RNA sequence: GCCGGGCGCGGUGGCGCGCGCCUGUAGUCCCAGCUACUCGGGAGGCUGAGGCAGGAGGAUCGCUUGAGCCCAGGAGUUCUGGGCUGCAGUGCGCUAUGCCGAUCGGGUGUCCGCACUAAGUUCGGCAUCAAUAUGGUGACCUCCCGGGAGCGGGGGACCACCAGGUUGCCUAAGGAGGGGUGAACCGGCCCAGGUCGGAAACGGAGCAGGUCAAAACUCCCGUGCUGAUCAGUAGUGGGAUCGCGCCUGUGAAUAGCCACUGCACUCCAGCCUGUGCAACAUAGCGAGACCCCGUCUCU
């Protein structure tokens, strides 16, 4: 099923091998049954299920060939290497340009969140370091303006198409000018939200392709229907060479294996994934890391940390000053802000012994505040050598109208002033001892 | 509609500025508004005890001194509830007596 | 009574001999009558002898070598 | 009379032995203890003398005599 | 006892600044002056050095007023100030004027301490603008040093002259507010 | 580099309790 | 022969005899007592010698004292002199340097925290007033009015200071003066952020920061009173010699060498004592005795 639930159930699969008294053709048989019957509840082609099935049997019976591996990695290998396979080989770059000029073009069924998704394409391209501006073709539906104009002032992305002056054809060709002599870097372009795949997505978009070169065209396309991904990737690659995909909400229903297997079965290039709602949770088609999440391994909590950037270079000039010794207060907001761009993780808790609670904020609760928890102000309202204080908290038992002061200043209570203080000395003697 | 009573109203240690509104004489040691609203409930008023809102003069974040008190004086035709009960500072009084009553703290 | 050449020659060594202590020496020479007397007394005691040219000789150097080393208290 | 040098004595002395080379006479007396000499020459009427308590005169005198014995036996 | 008052103000004065009009340092050689005898002084009088000490705490008093008439041409404020040192020297020329009264001291003597005390007397008057009250101790100064004069020889008796010609300005200015 | 940065990074989540 | 003599001492009844010394032209050997007194014997040579007198040289000695000179040791009045010279009187003559300021003369200066004065070096202590007209503000107190909040509108009371001014039975001094701090919870103002209240708009308190004649506090000049470390400082009086400094003075010298004269302390000789004296010039006196000779004497 679902990233979790297909994840689960592979991971279980894989698990038994491991305590494996002697590994087996029954074994394998029954693991490879245990496989089988995880991807069809992820929708998984059964066509698709079969041909992959027999590969991996075939890997792993006829040519048994551990060469240094043991019999059980050799077969966890085989049991990998085919789900990435089964995911499409490989990672599928969007090619940048040099000089000025990409021209790429949004379709999308109405239900699918290409509207959502232009605007986490957008983000995306300020990332990578160009500048994007969004041309807002789609004319009708003014709910797609609405949110798409919100998403774009809360970044900084200029976002044209207006009040309704003029049709599609020509409220981009307009868009294009007043944003060529603006660096037309890339331009992300979205034909309207139409109902079908039958004559009204690709009947239309190519009245919108005769005006601009189009030099990628992308299809939004929604992993909670499942293995209908496949109908609508044949349908786009033919008319379209330069189609790739881009698949959406992995969250939420449990065909989201099998709208990836499907895809990436016709060979149009997939080209993102969304994993969930905040602007930044539209990742490259990593299927690399998705299809081992899958598998399992899991793990995939170190991977996003150690594959990230600010993490060889960056995990220095903070590290210093780390093993000095100059407080922590000067490490909460980088951490909180460093990380704050979050990549989810299920060890975000797995440092905190304590079984409790949810146990569903595996999760990101913390992260849907809209800020970090109320540290930041108490911080800022003390003052730089209350902080410097070989121990802070010393300062507030001497002096006892220090944490009603600081608390009135920052605006939290004294009871929130007081869960900080003691909060720092519980990461120092931790540490000490 | 129910009108505010924060116990900094009726604290004879709190200073003018700092949100007293009735005169020392009359005001209490430090009313919390719990008392507050135990007091007023049994006089016949309707009252709800908002717990965890903070006043916004309350430099401390303790309990005792943190919560607020709504009571309703009108009734959605216009009479008042209880005719001895016109304005705020009416109740404000009312309850600033009471208190050094309650058995809690005449323990 | 004359003496023997030798033997008045040892007589008078003699005689100064005992006037060192105090006393006195005379002694006196004369022609003989070719010889010559010659007599040494200490007032006393009285020597005398004759000196020939045989004999001369032989006395002078002995007589003059007594006269020479007996005669020392002077200046 | 006495003489005080050797020099007159000699000769008064000489001459008077040859003006009569047979009843002069001379004598000759030495006290050691007493440390003096004393030459006299007489001719029983005339009297020559010579006192002295110097050495350097015994040779002076021995010589005296070594001369005499020689006019009496040429 | 004798003490010539005139003549060692117009000494005093004249070595120490007010050549130019320094009542800085000459209020300063006064205070100076002022240590020095009662440093060798420490029942009415023995010595006359006492009166020396009075006069110097009248002269002190006065060319602070001084120096701060000069200062109050822009800082009114002062001007109060100046009138009480004015008060104060006059307080010290009186008391002045008190010891000089002791039968130990000449008349002469007597003379200059009511002639002094006469010249502060109409100074604060002058600047109280008080123009009769003022005049009238202008002319008592005047008055008694005339008759200092004529008892001396022209020589001795220019000085008392020049300080006549002195305050002869300020008996003028009086009398053209009282016409 | 991947073991203090990511054993501090691990270190500190344990140890602050919020 | 006739072939020494003298002086002194000694056994001794007595002397030969004994000893020492000096000397004359002069000696040798052997043996021994006669004997109560008083004197040995023998050899060698020979008519020349022995004894004594006298005498020149004095070869010749002694004694003694004297000259001359004073020996040895030592209290000591002074006639006489001396050693050191004491004491007294008198002052010559000569010489040098002297109003380019000498003895004599006055005044003052020099190191000065003892007087005066210049410029004071340089450091301190203690102080620095009120009455008023009006405007300014900040705080507080007591009310009225509107309102669901924040809050807004209006009447007073009081305290604090500030303001350019006006004045005082007020002062030794009283400048309507200058700067700083104004911080962690006690000035005011402007207050990002946060915070409280608010649908919002905005406001309230108010931190960080900035700002101020107007909360307080403090420092500074100005000012008086009260003290001055220490004055390698300058000019005027004082203090040990006046030496070195300055100005002048009556006045005309001063310094040095010594001379003559009388008397003499203390010590000394002339004093006292005893071996004062050898013979340096020489004394008295006595005398031994050769050389010559007188006299007597002889186998």
Redesign the interface.
């Known amino acids: 099923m679902v990233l979790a639930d297909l994840g689960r159930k592979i991971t279980s699969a894989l698990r038994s091998l491991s305590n494996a008294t002697i590994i087996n053709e029954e074994v394998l048989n029954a693991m490879l049954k245990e496989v089988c019957t995880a991807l069809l509840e992820a929708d998984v082609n059964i066509k698709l299920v079969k041909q992959l099935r027999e590969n991996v049997k075939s890997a792993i019976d006829l040519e048994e060939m551990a060469s240094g591996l043991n019999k059980r990695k050799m077969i966890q290998h085989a049991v990998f290497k085919e789900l990435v396979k089964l995911v499409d080989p490989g990672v599928k770059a969007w090619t940048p340009t040099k000089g000025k000029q990409n021209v790429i073009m949004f379709v999308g069924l109405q239900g699918s969140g290409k509207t959502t998704t232009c605007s986490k394409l957008a983000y995306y391209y300020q990332r990578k370091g160009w500048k994007t501006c969004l041309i807002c073709a789609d004319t009708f539906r003014a709910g797609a303006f609405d949110q798409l104009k919100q998403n774009a002032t809360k970044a900084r992305i200029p976002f044209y198409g207006s009040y309704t002056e003029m049709d599609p054809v020509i409220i981009a060709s307009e868009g294009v000018e007043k944003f060529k002599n603006e660096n037309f870097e890339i331009i992300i372009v979205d034909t309207s939200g139409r109902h079908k795949q039958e004559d009204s997505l690709f009947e239309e978009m190519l009245q919108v392709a005769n005006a601009i070169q189009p030099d990628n065209i992308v299809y939004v396309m929604d992993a909670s229907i499942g293995q209908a991904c496949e109908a609508q990737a044949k349908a786009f690659k033919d008319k379209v060479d330069v189609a790739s995909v881009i698949v959406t909400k992995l969250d939420g229903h449990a065909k989201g294996g099998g709208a990836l297997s499907a895809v990436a079965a016709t060979k149009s290039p997939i080209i993102f994934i969304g994993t969930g709602e905040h602007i930044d949770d539209f990742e490259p088609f990593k299927t690399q890391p998705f299809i081992s999440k899958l598998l399992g391994m899991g793990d995939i909590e170190g991977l996003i940390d150690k594959v990230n950037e600010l993490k060889l270079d960056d995990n220095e000039a903070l590290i210093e000053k780390l093993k000095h010794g100059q407080f922590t207060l000067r490490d909460m907001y980088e951490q909180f802000q460093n990380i704050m761009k979050m990549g989810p993780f299920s060890q975000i808790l797995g440092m905190i012994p304590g079984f409790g609670t949810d146990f569903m904020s595996k999760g990101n609760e913390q992260e849907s505040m809209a800020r970090l928890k109320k540290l930041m102000t108490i911080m800022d309202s003390m003052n730089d050598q209350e902080l410097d204080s070989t121990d802070g908290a010393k300062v507030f038992s001497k002096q006892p109208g220090r944490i009603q002061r600081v608390a009135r200043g920052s605006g939290v209570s004294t009871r929130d002033v007081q869960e900080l203080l003691t909060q720092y000395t519980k990461f120092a003697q931790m540490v000490k001892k | 509609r129910f009108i505010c009573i924060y116990p900094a109203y009726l604290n004879n240690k709190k200073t003018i500025a700092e949100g007293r509104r009735i005169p020392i004489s009359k005001a209490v040691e430090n009313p919390t508004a719990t008392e507050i609203q135990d007091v007023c409930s049994a006089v016949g008023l309707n009252v709800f005890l908002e717990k965890n809102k903070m006043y916004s003069r309350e430099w401390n974040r303790d309990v005792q001194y943190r919560g607020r008190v709504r009571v309703q004086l009108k009734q959605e035709d216009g009479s008042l509830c209880l005719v001895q009960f016109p304005s705020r500072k009416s109740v404000m009084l009312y309850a600033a007596e009471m208190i050094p009553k309650l058995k809690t703290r005449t323990q | 009574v004359l003496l023997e050449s030798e033997q008045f020659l040892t007589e008078l060594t003699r005689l100064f001999q005992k006037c060192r202590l105090s006393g006195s020496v005379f002694i006196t020479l004369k022609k003989y009558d070719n010889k010559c007397l010659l007599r040494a007394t200490d007032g006393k005691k009285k020597i005398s002898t004759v000196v020939s040219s045989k004999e001369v000789n032989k006395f002078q150097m002995a007589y003059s070598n007594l006269l020479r080393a007996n005669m020392d208290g002077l200046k | 009379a006495q003489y005080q040098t050797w020099e007159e004595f000699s000769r008064a002395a000489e001459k008077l032995?040859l003006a009569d080379?047979?009843?002069?006479?001379?004598?000759?007396?030495?006290?050691?203890?007493?440390?003096?000499?004393?030459?006299?020459?007489?001719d029983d009427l005339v009297c020559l003398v010579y006192?002295?308590?110097?050495?350097?005169?015994?040779?002076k005198?021995?010589?005296?005599?070594?001369?005499?014995?020689?006019?009496?036996?040429? | 006892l004798s003490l010539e008052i005139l003549q060692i103000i117009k000494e005093s004065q004249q070595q120490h600044g007010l050549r130019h009009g320094d009542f800085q340092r000459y209020r300063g050689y006064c205070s100076r002056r002022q240590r020095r005898l009662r440093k060798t002084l420490n029942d009415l009088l023995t010595d006359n050095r006492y009166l020396l000490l009075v006069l110097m705490d009248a002269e002190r008093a006065w060319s602070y007023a001084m120096q701060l008439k000069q200062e109050a041409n822009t800082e009114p404020r002062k001007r109060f100030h100046l009138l009480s040192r004015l008060r104060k020297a006059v307080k010290h020329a009186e008391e002045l004027e008190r010891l000089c009264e002791s039968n130990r001291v000449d008349a002469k003597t007597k003379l200059e301490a009511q002639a002094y005390t006469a010249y502060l007397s109409g100074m604060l008057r002058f600047e109280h603008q008080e123009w009769k009250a003022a005049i009238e101790a202008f002319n008592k100064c005047k008055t008694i040093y005339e008759k200092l004069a004529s008892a001396f020889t022209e020589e001795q008796a220019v000085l008392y002259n020049q300080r006549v010609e002195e305050i002869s300005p300020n008996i003028r200015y009086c009398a053209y507010n009282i016409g | 580099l991947g073991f203090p940065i990511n054993f501090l990074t691990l270190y500190v989540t344990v140890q602050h309790k919020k």
């Open positions: 032995y080379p047979m009843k002069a006479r001379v004598v000759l007396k030495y006290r050691h203890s007493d440390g003096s000499l004393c030459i006299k020459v007489t006192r002295t308590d110097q050495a350097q005169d015994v040779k005198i021995e010589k005296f005599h070594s001369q005499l014995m020689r006019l009496m036996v040429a």
